[PDB]
Amino acid sequence: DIQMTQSPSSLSASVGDRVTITCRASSSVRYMHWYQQKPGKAPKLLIYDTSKLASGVPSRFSGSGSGTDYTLTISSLQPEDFATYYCQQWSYNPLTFGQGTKLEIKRTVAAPSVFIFPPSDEQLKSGTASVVCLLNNFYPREAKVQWKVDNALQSGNSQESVTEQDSKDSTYSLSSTLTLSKADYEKHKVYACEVTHQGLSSPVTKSFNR
Amino acid sequence: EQAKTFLDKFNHEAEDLFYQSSLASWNYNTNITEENVQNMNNAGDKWSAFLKEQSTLAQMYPLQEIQNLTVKLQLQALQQNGSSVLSEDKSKRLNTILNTMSTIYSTGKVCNPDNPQECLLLEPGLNEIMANSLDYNERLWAWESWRSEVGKQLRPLYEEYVVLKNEMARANHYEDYGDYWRGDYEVNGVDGYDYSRGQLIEDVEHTFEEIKPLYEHLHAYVRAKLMNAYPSYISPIGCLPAHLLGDMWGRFWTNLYSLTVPFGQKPNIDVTDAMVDQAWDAQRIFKEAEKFFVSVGLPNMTQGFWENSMLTDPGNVQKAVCHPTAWDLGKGDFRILMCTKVTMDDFLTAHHEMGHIQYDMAYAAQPFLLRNGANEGFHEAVGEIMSLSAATPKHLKSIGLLSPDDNETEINFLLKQALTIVGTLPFTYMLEKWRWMVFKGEIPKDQWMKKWWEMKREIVGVVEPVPHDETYCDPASLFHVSNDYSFIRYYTRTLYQFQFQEALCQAAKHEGPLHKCDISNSTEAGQKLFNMLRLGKSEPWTLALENVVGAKNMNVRPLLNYFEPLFTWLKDQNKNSFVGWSTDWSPY
Amino acid sequence: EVQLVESGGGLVQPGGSLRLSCAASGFTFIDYYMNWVRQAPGKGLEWVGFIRYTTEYSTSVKGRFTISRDNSKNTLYLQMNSLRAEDTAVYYCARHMYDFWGQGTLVTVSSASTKGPSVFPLAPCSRSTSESTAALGCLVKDYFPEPVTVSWNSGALTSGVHTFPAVLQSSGLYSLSSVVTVPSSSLGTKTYTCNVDHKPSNTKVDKR
Ligand SMILES: [Zn+2]
């Protein structure tokens, strides 16, 4: 069958810059078709036919290509262009896509606002404890979130969730939850959570006393 | 295979638009008025823009390795094209010219000189004189008065017509506007069977040499027996006067049968006297043509045909084109504009025009872009095959036009056919050859009518009763020239006509002279043609011919075998007359 | 308008069957190609199949799926006769031609049964260090079918609301957080209600 793959399998770029994504097909030189998929929503057609903007797509976008090498470019990258971009074949009996390209938008480094939440009343009657910490409105995504109980690092029984970039701020929000048995929660007092991040002059920690 | 999708939306719009344009043209011919001129212009402009659009789009889909050949052919057809052919001014000028040449020809009045407000039209008036009158003074009046009051006004129009028609052909990658017409016969890309645009001329001039022995003896015979009708007016050496040849253009010598009967005491083979005696209506002629196709194995005509077509003249107030016209409007609508006369002429023309439709009905089974007929001569040959069969003395007996019944009769009939058929072979060769030499820039406007009388005397054997200034335009006084149409079809037709008949007379199990053969109550011959009739453009005319006859080209041999008994006879009777003609005789 | 509307089932047992459907309007149905695509949560886009009225499939699904039209209802159907856990993905319908997308429906294939969530609200102790703004939230825990809806203040508040992806626990059950970012001066004054619908289990919960 026919295949294709995009050269930047991932791409980080800054606001307002001149950016480019490239797809290399395996075997043919055909009218290529581009799509822009915002996460959590359906893929939206960007370039109906190479160098022809799909209806509704603004002048900032442009496509081109020849050979097996077809490209997509944006004149001035807007903060609202965070997406994963795909290419469609339209050419042969086996329709296919390739390795998608995810684009992340760069911005001034920003430190998270750190919040911590104790487990709920019902949850403690139920039998376990979920201690929750939030990292709201920060860039870049990269951060280490470490749970401490009576200053002992808790390894395991901790999980994290990452939002997609806010299309206006280009910032992330990240949650972290520590799952304990009620008995282990009752056995301790000082519950803290420490965050390391570029935007921080030093690691930050929030806490509560049981 | 991916573009079979596109062709469905083409066919959907093409059939709506083709019908839209074709009906607006029908409205005009039926009812000449500004109601229908502007509709015929607009629907034509829209249909034409669609074609140049859709050809541009088909050229965005190249053709290779498509197995369902239906798609391969519809694409190849779209590839033939009109591309950016004209500016709006030049489209609107040709529209105005041909909305005027067709109007002048079909509405042109001739004032009777003894009263300047009394007038007469070509159909049926002036052609009544040219066909039946035996008064030289009167036949001459009708003949020139048309070419003077009507044929002169047509000249500067055909003059601009030539300019812009020739620019069109080059824009679509042709040699000249005559080459555009000549390309109808081109077979290209096929390995074992092919044909060039120029080969049409090589074949026409080549086979035309085999006509001259039969035509010159027919010429001398007509000359000797016209001299017994127009005593002191015709030379026993020179060329015949044009206005004495049975019609206003000297095309069909049919009407000279009245004057050239080989055996006058035989019961009349020309059944016009009987058709008037039996009070035949215009429909009965077509009913009795519909029946013949049924006896071939073919369907009845449609109910739309019988309540849409204008088979008689309208009231004199309603101006109309009256030349026999057969329509495929698309979408199943079939019409004919006969304006029928009660005569064997329009009788055998009814089988001709109805043969057009039966060919249209047959190839309606193929997609839109193949619904044209194999070529020009094929679309005409289908009608002549049938009329040739319907006209036999045998078939005329069975119809009821001849009461129950010879070497003398066989010649008596065979001359009438030669007068109609053979008389037009040199007239046709002359006409388009002149038009092509004008399109190729070989005859200047200084020498248009000069070269026309040149060819009348030398090639056809016909003269001007009064030498004409260049002011006249004599070819445009004819329908096929005035209304933009091609004529070389009629030469190829006649040769096709007798190839096919020879093949059909084997299927119908004739065992005899092609002269006596008709196709009636013969499924074998109907199945044989209908196999081919459906093809349209799906196959090149070269193979559509070879799949019915043994030949893969236009051929003159069976034509002569149809007439060989008349040729032997004409050689006997012309020892008392000069056979050739003088290049320079002029009754002036 | 050009409109594709998709519907179908959610959680189905492996080795079982399920039929999806999409309705189309704003255009002639039979003038277009109708296609199913497929996006496993952690994969790119796959072609599932094509219908002109030819019908073609990707190799992965031809032995298991069937695509059908009703060109008078203006609908596209996908019938999945034999399902693998591999077939778990969001299924989209699309209009292709010589584009517009409906919004995908999540078909999840795994053996475990629907459970439904427990909602555990969240709030920090009074702290004036987190003072330019203060976070409120609620945690939804231990629900197997992934579709879940979180609204706040009966769908009113959206200005500061963020909702996190569901994560898979050791238990094989899913859970997620949710947060509203509010001025710290409104914590004790304005109400903020966590509104949760888990349609697969028919669970409605409203808490503060
Ligand atoms: Zn004809």
Short mmCIF file of C-alpha atoms and ligand atoms in Angstrom, two decimals, chain B residues 352-353 356 379-380 490, ligand 1:
data_model
loop_
_atom_site.label_atom_id
_atom_site.label_comp_id
_atom_site.label_asym_id
_atom_site.label_seq_id
_atom_site.Cartn_x
_atom_site.Cartn_y
_atom_site.Cartn_z
CA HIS B 352 -34.77 9.90 -45.33
CA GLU B 353 -35.57 12.16 -42.38
CA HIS B 356 -32.19 10.07 -39.16
CA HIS B 379 -26.10 9.91 -40.43
CA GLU B 380 -27.25 10.59 -43.99
CA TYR B 490 -23.74 14.01 -49.56
ZN ZN D 1 -30.36 14.41 -44.26
#
